[PDB]
Structures are given as structure tokens and as C-alpha cells.
Design a protein around this motif. Sequence first.
Motif, mmCIF file in Angstrom:
data_model
loop_
_atom_site.group_PDB
_atom_site.id
_atom_site.type_symbol
_atom_site.label_atom_id
_atom_site.label_comp_id
_atom_site.label_asym_id
_atom_site.label_seq_id
_atom_site.Cartn_x
_atom_site.Cartn_y
_atom_site.Cartn_z
ATOM 1 N N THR A 1 0.744 -1.012 -0.050
ATOM 2 C CA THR A 1 -0.044 0.017 0.078
ATOM 3 C C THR A 1 1.008 1.244 0.060
ATOM 4 O OG1 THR A 1 -1.699 -1.235 1.079
ATOM 5 C CG2 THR A 1 -1.966 1.201 1.164
ATOM 6 N N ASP A 2 1.954 1.454 0.863
ATOM 7 C CA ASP A 2 2.919 2.366 0.756
ATOM 8 C C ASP A 2 3.514 2.499 -0.456
ATOM 9 O OD1 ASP A 2 2.120 3.217 3.292
ATOM 10 O OD2 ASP A 2 3.601 2.256 4.332
ATOM 11 N N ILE A 3 3.875 1.394 -1.229
ATOM 12 C CA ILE A 3 4.348 1.491 -2.410
ATOM 13 C C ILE A 3 3.315 2.209 -3.324
ATOM 14 C CG2 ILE A 3 5.754 0.198 -4.412
ATOM 15 C CD1 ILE A 3 7.250 0.665 -1.505
ATOM 16 N N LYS A 4 2.325 1.621 -3.227
ATOM 17 C CA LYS A 4 1.208 2.416 -4.052
ATOM 18 C C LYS A 4 1.021 3.770 -3.784
ATOM 19 C CE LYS A 4 -3.534 3.261 -4.820
ATOM 20 N NZ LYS A 4 -4.411 4.162 -4.243
ATOM 21 N N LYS A 5 1.163 4.185 -2.583
ATOM 22 C CA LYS A 5 1.219 5.628 -2.343
ATOM 23 C C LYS A 5 2.477 6.267 -2.965
ATOM 24 C CE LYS A 5 2.741 7.260 1.279
ATOM 25 N NZ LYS A 5 3.761 8.384 0.925
ATOM 26 N N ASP A 6 3.578 6.189 -2.701
ATOM 27 C CA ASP A 6 4.870 6.697 -3.687
ATOM 28 C C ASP A 6 5.488 5.630 -4.209
ATOM 29 O OD1 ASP A 6 6.799 9.114 -4.094
ATOM 30 O OD2 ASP A 6 8.068 7.607 -3.247
ATOM 31 N N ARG B 1 8.400 6.185 -6.295
ATOM 32 C CA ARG B 1 9.575 6.398 -6.693
ATOM 33 C C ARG B 1 10.769 5.047 -6.021
ATOM 34 N NH1 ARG B 1 9.450 11.001 -4.628
ATOM 35 N NH2 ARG B 1 10.089 10.505 -2.402
ATOM 36 N N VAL B 2 11.811 4.862 -6.837
ATOM 37 C CA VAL B 2 12.343 3.949 -6.531
ATOM 38 C C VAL B 2 13.278 3.931 -5.313
ATOM 39 C CG1 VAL B 2 14.440 4.114 -8.197
ATOM 40 C CG2 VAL B 2 13.544 1.840 -7.510
ATOM 41 N N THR B 3 13.762 5.090 -4.996
ATOM 42 C CA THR B 3 14.644 5.383 -3.709
ATOM 43 C C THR B 3 13.836 5.477 -2.596
ATOM 44 O OG1 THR B 3 14.711 7.510 -4.127
ATOM 45 C CG2 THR B 3 16.495 6.390 -5.249
ATOM 46 N N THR B 4 12.517 5.357 -2.518
ATOM 47 C CA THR B 4 11.746 5.366 -1.224
ATOM 48 C C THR B 4 12.015 4.078 -0.559
ATOM 49 O OG1 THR B 4 10.006 6.604 -2.728
ATOM 50 C CG2 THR B 4 9.416 6.348 -0.547
ATOM 51 N N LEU B 5 12.224 3.102 -1.143
ATOM 52 C CA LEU B 5 12.529 1.912 -0.213
ATOM 53 C C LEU B 5 13.824 1.981 0.689
ATOM 54 C CD1 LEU B 5 10.540 0.542 -2.827
ATOM 55 C CD2 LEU B 5 11.623 -1.645 -2.201
ATOM 56 N N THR B 6 14.636 2.742 -0.033
ATOM 57 C CA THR B 6 15.898 2.911 0.836
ATOM 58 C C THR B 6 15.255 3.876 2.083
ATOM 59 O OG1 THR B 6 16.378 5.089 -0.534
ATOM 60 C CG2 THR B 6 17.332 3.028 -1.307
ATOM 61 N N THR B 7 14.490 4.697 2.068
ATOM 62 C CA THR B 7 13.872 5.444 2.951
ATOM 63 C C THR B 7 12.479 5.287 3.749
ATOM 64 O OG1 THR B 7 13.015 7.215 1.061
ATOM 65 C CG2 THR B 7 15.419 7.359 2.067
ATOM 66 N N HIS B 8 12.287 4.042 3.656
ATOM 67 C CA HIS B 8 11.079 3.897 4.361
ATOM 68 C C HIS B 8 11.391 3.554 6.037
ATOM 69 C CE1 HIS B 8 8.725 2.892 0.699
ATOM 70 N NE2 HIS B 8 7.557 3.161 1.464
ATOM 71 N N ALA B 9 10.365 2.929 6.836
ATOM 72 C CA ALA B 9 10.563 2.904 8.288
ATOM 73 C C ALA B 9 11.080 1.428 8.413
ATOM 74 C CB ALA B 9 9.221 3.145 8.786
ATOM 75 N N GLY B 10 12.426 1.418 8.403
ATOM 76 C CA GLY B 10 13.050 0.206 8.721
ATOM 77 C C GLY B 10 12.381 -1.216 8.147
ATOM 78 N N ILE B 11 12.304 -1.378 6.602
ATOM 79 C CA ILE B 11 11.890 -2.545 6.016
ATOM 80 C C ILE B 11 12.518 -3.652 6.325
ATOM 81 C CG2 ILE B 11 10.240 -1.296 4.733
ATOM 82 C CD1 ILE B 11 13.746 -2.021 3.293
ATOM 83 N N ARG B 12 13.849 -3.646 6.518
ATOM 84 C CA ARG B 12 14.901 -4.955 6.288
ATOM 85 C C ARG B 12 14.615 -5.870 7.334
ATOM 86 N NH1 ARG B 12 19.819 -5.015 4.850
ATOM 87 N NH2 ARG B 12 20.235 -2.666 4.596
#
Lengths: 48, 48
Positions: free
Chosen positions: A1-6, A8-19
Motif C-alpha cells: 500500500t505504501d508503495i502504491k502511495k509513492d 519512486r524507487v529510492t523510497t525503499l531506501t527511506t522507509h521505516a526500517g523495512i529490512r
Amino acid sequence: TDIKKDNRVTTLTTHAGIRNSLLTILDQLQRCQRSLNEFLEEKRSAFP
Amino acid sequence: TNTGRVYRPKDCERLVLYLKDINLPKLDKWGTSTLVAFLQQVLTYQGF
């Protein structure tokens, strides 16, 4: 859902601790595979 | 960071310290608990 929001491919570098979210989802899928072993042998006995 | 070392919650955004009891810690013989003085320091000056 948050990927559906934004998208841009470098947002996965800047999400809330996805690792740890990704690693835990992978680990739980491994465990439900180990639960599915028995049903796999059932269908292997079904079709030769 | 710059301007002194700091603490930040891991893998989240808003860490919540849920203090269970506040009436219960111990006064000295004047009437001032060190616990509530410490939390006054934190909620006023964001450090210690």
C-alpha cells in the motif's frame, strides 16, 4: 500500500526500517513451507 | 550526531515509555522524589 502511495524507487531506501520486515516475512514463509510438507506428500501419493 | 551523542528508537518512529505507577516512588525527608525530578528534567530539557 505504501508503495502504491509513492512509487519512486529510492523510497525503499527511506522507509521505516523495512529490512527486518522483509527478513521476517521470508522466515515465516519458510516455516509455513515446513508446515506444508505433509500436504505435499498427500498430493504426491495422489498423482503418481 | 553533531552537538553531543543522542538516542533514537530502532526500526520505528515513535517510541513510547509507558510508566505504570507515579504516586508510588519514594520521597526523601523534604518531599522531592528523584524520579519525578529526573522526568521533569527530561520533559523540559530533552536530555540528561
